[PDB]
Amino acid sequence: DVFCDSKLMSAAIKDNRAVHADMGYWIESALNDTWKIEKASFIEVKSCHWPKSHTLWSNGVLESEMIIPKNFAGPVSQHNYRPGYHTQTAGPWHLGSLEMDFDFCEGTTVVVTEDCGNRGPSLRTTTASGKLITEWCCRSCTLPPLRYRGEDGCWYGMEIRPLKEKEENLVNSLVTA
């Protein structure tokens, strides 16, 4: 396990905003009734460990709940939390360059219902044929949905699955992480 180089690294918290930053990372959290992560930019995704010297709220942190995984330079921090979401082990981290936020992917809807599949590897909103998957679900997640945006389009959090996944043999053309 390598630690991330901390020469250009920074962390800062003020009135309603907290930022863990690097050369290529920008992880922004905010307070609305709760401190929680809100947006995150990755020029390049790396494999080092974020040092706790530059980490806010680093006590009592569950690895299962850090949105950005520890093995991918995720700060071990309660600022790295989002209610209704667990660690994004199988997000679209292969994109290299991506933006993560909480908003709907273009042309799609997300509803909270237990009539949904369990969480799994993140899925692109367009299939391998390019068809758009409109309706999405989550068992126990919170809205707005966890969203990734990258060169090949928009992806959803592990918790978010196609509402009609069991229909039309959708699984055969899904684009997955």
Epitope: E106, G107, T126, A128, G130, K131, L132, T134, G153
Partner: antibody
Framework: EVKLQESGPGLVRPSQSLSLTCSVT?????????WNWIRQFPGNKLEWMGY???????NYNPSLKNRISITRDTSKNQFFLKLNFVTTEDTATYYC?????????????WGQGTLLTVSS | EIVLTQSPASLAVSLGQRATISCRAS??????????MHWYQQKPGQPPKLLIY???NVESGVPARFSGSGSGTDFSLNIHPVEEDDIAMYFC?????????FGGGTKLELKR
């Protein structure tokens, strides 16, 4: 989901210009897909005419290079096909279509098509 | 321009039997191990509808009686067992090079 719909006149006089509209619903034309125009002649032959990218760059079939122009209106979520001139050989059914750029690029979406007759 | 030749132009077929349509490209359509060739069905008064993408992948929602095969310059669409709903026109299309081009079409007609 994504729907395409063509619109325009069903009848245009020879040697006059031609303007076709494709209205896109359920997805913004500024991401994901390339937006193409394809026509089908009475004998069922299909000819790909051109596309405009989600970043607004067009690419045209050489058979039409000097008479074709594909533009877009992002505020109305439409794109447009223009022929500087038409003859009676351009009588055909004109379709709008799209393919997702980061795929093998099959034409997954088509409009209903609009009949265009070129006659005097 | 990549020229696609479809064969035959018209195919007579019995319900329940196997139908095979061929499309041959003038140059290779492959790109990084993927064959950039697609198959469409068209009914009268309707736009073409995607049946097979990348020349062996059945589109979601397309019945299992459709299949695709081939590589390089030679490709095949396969329908078995043929049903009444399959009496229609079929087209191949290449996306390996611009300008994109279609095959001349194949009419699947009922045999008698």
């Amino acid at each position: 989901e994504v729907k395409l719909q063509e619109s325009g006149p069903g009848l245009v006089r020879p040697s006059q210009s031609l303007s076709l509209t494709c209205s896109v619903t359920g997805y913004s034309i500024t991401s994901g897909y390339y937006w193409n125009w394809i026509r089908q002649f009475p004998g069922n032959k299909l000819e790909w005419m051109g596309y405009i990218s989600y970043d607004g760059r067009s690419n045209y079939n050489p058979s039409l290079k000097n008479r074709i122009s594909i533009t877009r209106d992002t505020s109305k979520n439409q794109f447009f096909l223009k022929l500087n001139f038409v003859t009676t050989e351009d009588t055909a059914t004109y379709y709008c279509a799209s393919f997702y750029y980061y795929t093998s690029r099959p034409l997954v979406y088509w409009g209903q098509g609009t009949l265009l007759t070129v006659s005097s | 321009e990549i020229v696609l030749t479809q064969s035959p132009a018209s195919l007579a077929v019995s319900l329940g039997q196997r139908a095979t349509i061929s499309c041959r490209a003038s140059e290779s359509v492959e790109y990084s191990g993927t064959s950039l060739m697609h198959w469409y069905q068209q009914k009268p008064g309707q736009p073409p509808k995607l049946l097979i993408y990348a020349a062996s992948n059945v589109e979601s929602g397309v019945p299992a009686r459709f299949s695709g095969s081939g590589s390089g310059t030679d490709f095949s669409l396969n329908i078995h067992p043929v049903e009444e709903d399959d009496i229609a026109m079929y087209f191949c299309q290449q996306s390996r090079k611009v300008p994109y081009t279609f095959g001349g079409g194949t009419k699947l007609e009922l045999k008698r």
